[PDB]
């Protein structure tokens, strides 16, 4: 028959990276997780208690609960035509701080700095992130750089 066990097709998902086996580096146990923090679940195969299901590997969600050695993470799962709120009780070494969040935080601090600076001088600071605009005009000089010609190579078998 067909097997749909709790850890099917995890032959590689619950590996330990090359020359990264063994004990977990301790900083993960020293990270601090507050309710509302956005974390992502890279399951660590070394320790098998409180493991996430293979679906949640690489999934990101807010932390709704903080426990003795685990946290409660709310992940959203696509179940048919709608999403469901899944709540996970994960050991603290299966998760890590998403750095996408803190990047937004640092911009937020920057925007407040740019606003407070704009208070005195420099109105219209344009806090918006612009997309990569097309490059404006320029002058390309030719000193030491007379354009060397190029012609397609003849075909040799090379082998």
């Amino acid at each position: 028959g067909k097997s749909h066990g709790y850890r099917s097709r995890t032959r590689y998902m619950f590996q330990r990276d090359f020359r990264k086996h063994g004990a977990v580096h301790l900083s993960t146990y020293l990270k601090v997780y507050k309710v509302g923090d956005i974390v992502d679940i890279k399951a660590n195969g070394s320790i098998q208690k409180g493991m996430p299901h293979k679906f949640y590997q690489g999934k990101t969600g807010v932390v709704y609960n903080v426990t003795k050695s685990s946290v409660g993470v709310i992940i959203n799962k696509m179940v048919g035509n709608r999403y469901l709120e899944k709540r996970l009780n994960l050991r603290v070494e299966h998760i890590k701080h998403s750095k996408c969040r803190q990047e937004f935080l640092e911009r937020v601090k920057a925007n407040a700095a740019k606003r407070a600076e704009a208070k005195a001088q420099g109105v219209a600071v344009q806090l918006k992130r612009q997309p990569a605009q097309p490059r404006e005009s320029r002058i390309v000089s030719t000193e030491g750089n007379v354009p060397q010609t190029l012609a397609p190579v003849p075909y040799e078998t090379f082998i």
């Binding site: 709704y64 409660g72 709310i74 048919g80 035509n81 999403y83 709120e85 709540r87």
Partner: protein, 58 residues
Amino acid sequence: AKSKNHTAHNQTRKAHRNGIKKPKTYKYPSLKGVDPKFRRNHKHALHGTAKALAAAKK
């Protein structure tokens, strides 16, 4: 006799017809499954905050 056993054809097209909608979260999400020791206190914190506010609000 024999037929198709499983097919995911048109399942994604069906799913999006009425859209795939997020669960439209809320301020104050439900406090279920969170630690009973935490919640047992969060009540008393809210009880005190209301009494302090009402005393301030006369």
